[PDB]
């Protein structure tokens, strides 16, 4: 049992928490699309641990390659290469679009999103960093300043230079011309006061394709294109996060491929290294050359570190393989339209939104006050545990909130099933 | 051979350059105190790679632990607890001093830093941070803000309240006091300064025990001690960086138990993790509890991951039964004498310090003007190569260019006689 | 003649340039409404100077003032009191609404911004300043970091906690809801992205009542009371800056009369002196004495300097007994009805706003496009002058060229109908 | 009397507390060295008030000069010139070294600060800002966060990139090369801690030729030569507040004179508006031209005014015609001669320091240990006052409170001889 009193003893006196809560429950094993307590209960995991674990849990292919490189090529000094890292970069080169050629390989998202925001500021010889107000970029300093859906409170100053303009949320609108949602016009009033704000020091724009600590907000028709436009107009990089769309999750290898809009930067992290330490950024033969001859930085311990981007390459090559994008579009649609027959049954969920194996199902009080159905949410997350499903709800300001679902891309057709039922049960059983 | 003509046109075509260049070769295996480049010639690793490969390469039973846990328990949703991260947060708490006693489990060093300089931040509810001028603690804003020995320039300020102090040097003095290098009187008149510049927002003093990138300077006599008194006369945690001096590279388990001066957060990580991504800030119960009432946040995706927590608990197993901390000084001895012989043999030898397996050599042009033997550095450490020896010089502004030694605790008696060798040939065939 | 090529020659030679252009002619006098230049012609000052002179130039009662104190009590250490000092500030709390109690005499307007922005924040403990992005409050440090019409660029980050929300803007509106212009759902807009942002040191937010230099823009129904509000839920201070407003001339004694909204620290300067440097800071008597308690220091060389003081008391009591506050509504009545008329006469008239004798009309190119029209603002201004009337037009970015009319309170029905006339001569001139 | 309890009711009731505590008089009159109280009792005023009185209060030339423009030409919109501004703009590059030619005329000394430090700000494209540690530059923004001898705590960061390094103190040494106390290495030491903090980003140095509000500390033989070549090495302004050092107080009209060390900007104020605000900065046509091109902007509501500059203009006049500068010599010989007779008298007199009519008497318990005479100084202060001398103490961190003696250049022989003697008496009744 769950109880080993000595354990909790244990986390108890020897663990610094951060954030949330401690699951009362203690993880024995891992496989497929399920964690295992230690009654030895299954326990299926839609959210792919942390978002990451885009094979399941323990590969079998992933199990090899680890295993092939722990005991041949493990860690290496920054300055030496060996084939998987230009392995990889090559990969990442050819998979991603036209005018991504060259890659960085490194260990976190927050990493990777401070590797391409020192690149951008360097590149340009300016400073000012504009966000979403409901960003996740990370924990550190710089993709911290950028981030606004939490964490800016009782920590000191923000970096200087940091703002913020709201997404576009089109369950929640906000800006109106002419009785219509107009988030173009939304973007464009943004623009203006950032611009009466500015020191004249604009340097890069961050983004997420889908904000997903922020809510499963998808940017909606359009707007990645005006986005893209507003920058360059002002000699400012365009920052993309793919952190939890890249890698195929969304039904495209890359969300951006969808609006076929290029950033200037694309970071990488979660999905990439699936469920290890793996991430990296990946820009054009131009700004990688004038970053060079800038004299760029961004030396770590595991910058180019074999045994991780051995993994990555495997990764990458399994989803090709599998067609597991094409599979994220077909497991989608069958996920979406049951949350949809839910939405039908309960009249608690407000919205069903997302993209491929991205989704995310809005809790509401009442589905035209729209008002947040506040406890509710939790009881819901509660129950579905005890039934056996890993849920995650992000309970922001001013919505309502909000689940997080991201299976393994290998998931089954049964696997869905199983989750829509037992989510279905939490539900009845909660209210 | 090392020139697949395919292999360095990708890596020209789709690598990120960040920070020196890259060996010319291609590194195909590695074991022990080895890596192997494409022709099969084995090279003495004497910096375990980018100092992390505290077992040197591809140990067994660090193989054996990968595996274990690839194919069992892998990468978890952040809010479930596993037995490896709860023991691995446990043996910490009982190997480290008494007053640190709760750990958090990251990937990076500078993630460490990070989560510490936030815990501070938050638990004095201010924000100044105070470091070394020749210090290094990572790429990622916050701990890039605390870093001076480079990285400042071209790329925006740094944190609102960063400070500097001089770190203490005896091979170049430079305050005196009676005929004497007083580096207590030196360390008042610092504060002075910086008491007067503080906005009565000092948070943290953030060093390493012995700075690396810095040169191989170790905090003298009685210095940590007094810097204790100054950061708790002034209400200040004192953070302490043992990335590159932790587990038992200096002959103690921690550099911090040598002194007897226990600070308010410990940082580690490259050795914690023998190559793999793996790090830590460990902490009072006190402090600890505080950031938790106020709220601390440091949540990211591989925060409590079960694989590298597994191999962090092997990597201390073994360090711990094969008794390698007395082995580092031991073998410290061995390999200092070996320095001191060359620099009786060589007069560009200025210098031999450091301590245990972190020892650092000065090169200068007249061992009495002390003057700094610029590309004399550079081709010993080119011949080095040449000779099978991977060597690592760091080249600072006033002070000859320093190589940074440290080898495998595992390094063998022969092998450390190879690498004076050897590093006696490169100097000849260099003047 | 205005020709003097020795003055000409000696203005190129050792005058700093400031902004702007200098006016080609030497003015050798002043009395009343007008200016004379070289040749002895009158200039029409419709904008009272640098909108200070409200008693007009060289007023006798201001005359016999100064001299009255230049040989009895001129300038003192800072920590000796005088009647004129008590007097003043005494004054300055009869005539305030109740609630604004103690008072800090200065210099100038940008000094008296500081001083109130610095009490904000001593007394809450915090820094973050938030402003319109069309204010002026400056050209010093933190005056200037709250300032947004201009200014912003080449010079440096702003002050760390900057933050800007859009002003309303009846004639050029931008937030719509239900096809209406809602400038308190854009308010409450505006507050929540502040709110996303804020690092949680909400300070201050500081406004004029009416938006001199962003283009006579006054606050509408209802707008002051919502922003107080907001405020007050924030633990924020609420500045109010009627550098240009203040001392009768929107038609009451000061604006924030109008509205009956009290702010927590209210700012005066321009009026104040007339002509004379002169400034304050007028606060209630609990921020005063919290302030006190927390160490608040602004002490300068001329704070609480008897000379200005005395010239301030008898400005207050000229206006005070010869009516000029109604005398203001009356005159300004005159003024904007004769507005009113050109704009019935040329299409080139957009608007006529603004308050008492604080007056602007707005040049456009089509009265439907609100297209702005350059140039022609110009060519008017420079008719103007030709003419013989001083005028000030202000460009700012998506509006058209405003003209800036603030002519004495003393000024005469007749000088009045001449402006309007030279006005009229300018308009049909210039097209 | 001194006691109208309705005056002190007042003052009480509607005067805000700015630092330090407001004596217990009424000041009714001023004439010449003297100020007089209610009861009619001439105060000796040894500061010249706020240090501003050069000519003494109500000097007829001034009160004359005065009239004449308050009556003639009072105050003007900023783009309009007239004579008083052109001839004292010229006069200031006439009476300054070469390599200062241009002038902009403002109000007050903070001011003047601010206008200077946001020309090199601009000029040089940098941001950072380099001060002393004892410094004082007034109570607004820039100039406060250039101020590190008190102000800094409980309101919010400073501006980003300011630094400070220590001033030379010859009295109380702290930095020492072969047992002397090189202030040249001190100064070689301070800039390279600086040079390794800076951001890159070095835009100027702002220093006092001699420290005032820091305790009379006049920067040492060859120091400024030493200084002004660290600026130039580094592409930085040297900008010198000459504040209180100005118009001939310490024996030359400009205290950079004395050294042949020209700034490239210099800042005036106290001394030259005679009590009337009054500032400027000067500097040269280069610099100027640049700032201009740039688009330099400092546009204030008494920019130019010509009443002031009038007076201004007088002030330089009848300096320069009554050889009070010389006289500044003379009389501070005499002054100085008194006090270190007094030291030989009293051995609470540790130091006396300064130059001309700029002298500091540093307070001590021991002359030997050079222990801070507590206390001591306020007993002395307060006697001096009851005997009927006006001083002024300065306190600050680690060394003996200091009274700052600045007696009016038109002081005589036996106003001198009354201080001296006054000064012996409360030392007596003092101890
Ligand atoms: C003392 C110290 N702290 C923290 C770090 C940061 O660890 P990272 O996040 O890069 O894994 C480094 C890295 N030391 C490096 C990094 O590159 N070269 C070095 O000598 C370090 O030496
Ligand atoms: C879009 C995005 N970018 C970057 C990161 C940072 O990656 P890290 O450095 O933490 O590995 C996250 C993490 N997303 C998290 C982290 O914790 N919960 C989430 O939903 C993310 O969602
Ligand atoms: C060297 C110096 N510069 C600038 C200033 C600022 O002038 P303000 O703007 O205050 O008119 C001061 C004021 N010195 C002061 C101010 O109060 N007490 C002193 O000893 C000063 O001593
Ligand atoms: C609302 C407001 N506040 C403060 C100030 C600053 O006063 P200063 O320190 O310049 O005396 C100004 C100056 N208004 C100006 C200054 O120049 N042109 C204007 O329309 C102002 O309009
Ligand atoms: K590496
Ligand atoms: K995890
Ligand atoms: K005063
Ligand atoms: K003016
Ligand atoms: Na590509
Ligand atoms: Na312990
Ligand atoms: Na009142
Ligand atoms: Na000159």
Chains 1, 2, 3, 4 share one sequence.
Not at 23 to 34: C, L, N, T, V
Not at 142 to 165: D, L, M, N
Not at 282 to 305: C, Q
Not at 319 to 335: E, S, T, Y
Request: net charge negative.
């Amino acid at each position: 049992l769950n109880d080993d009193a000595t354990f909790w003893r244990n986390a108890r006196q020897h663990l610094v928490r951060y954030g949330g809560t401690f699951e009362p429950m203690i993880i024995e094993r891992a496989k497929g699309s399920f964690v295992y307590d230690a009654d030895g209960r299954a326990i299926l995991d839609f959210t792919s641990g942390q978002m990451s674990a885009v094979l399941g849990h323990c590969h079998p292919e992933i199990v090899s390659v680890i295993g092939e490189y722990a005991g041949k090529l493990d860690h290496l000094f920054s300055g030496m290469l060996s084939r998987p890292v230009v392995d990889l970069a090559t990969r990442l080169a050819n998979i991603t679009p036209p005018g991504l050629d060259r890659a960085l390989l490194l260990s976190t998202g927050a990493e990777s999103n401070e590797a391409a925001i020192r690149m951008a500021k360097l590149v340009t010889g300016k400073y000012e960093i504009v966000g979403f107000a409901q960003s996740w970029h990370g924990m550190t300093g710089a993709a911290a300043s950028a981030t606004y859906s939490a964490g800016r409170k009782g920590v000191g100053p923000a970096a200087v230079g940091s703002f913020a303009i709201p997404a576009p949320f089109t369950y929640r609108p906000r800006f109106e011309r002419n009785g219509a949602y107009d988030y173009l016009a939304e973007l464009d009033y943004a623009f203006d006061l950032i611009d009466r704000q500015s020191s004249g020091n604009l340097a890069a724009f961050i983004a997420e394709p889908i904000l997903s600590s922020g809510g499963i907000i998808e940017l909606p028709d359009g707007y990645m294109a005006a986005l893209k436009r507003k920058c360059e107009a002002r000699g400012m990089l365009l920052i993309l996060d793919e952190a939890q769309t890249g890698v195929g999750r969304t039904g495209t290898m890359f969300a951006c491929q969808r609006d076929g809009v290029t950033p200037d930067i694309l970071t990488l992290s979660k999905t990439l290294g699936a469920g290890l330490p793996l991430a990296a950024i990946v820009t054009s033969a131009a700004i990688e050359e004038r970053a060079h001859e800038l004299g760029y930085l961004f030396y770590t311990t595991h910058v180019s570190d074999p045994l991780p981007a051995a993994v990555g390459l495997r990764v990458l090559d399994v989803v090709q393989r599998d067609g597991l994008v094409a599979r994220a579009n077909v497991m989608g649609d069958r996920l979406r339209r049951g949350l949809l027959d839910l939405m039908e049954r309960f009249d608690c969920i407000g919205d069903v939104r997302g993209r491929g194996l991205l989704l995310g199902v809005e809790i509401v009080k009442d589905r035209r006050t729209k008002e947040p159905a506040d406890g509710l949410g939790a009881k819901i997350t509660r129950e579905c545990m005890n039934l056996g499903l890993s849920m995650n709800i992000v309970q922001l300001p001013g919505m309502g909130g909000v689940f997080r679902i991201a299976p393994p891309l290998t998931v089954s057709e049964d696997e869905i099933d199983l989750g829509l039922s037992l989510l279905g049960q939490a539900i009845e059983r909660a209210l």
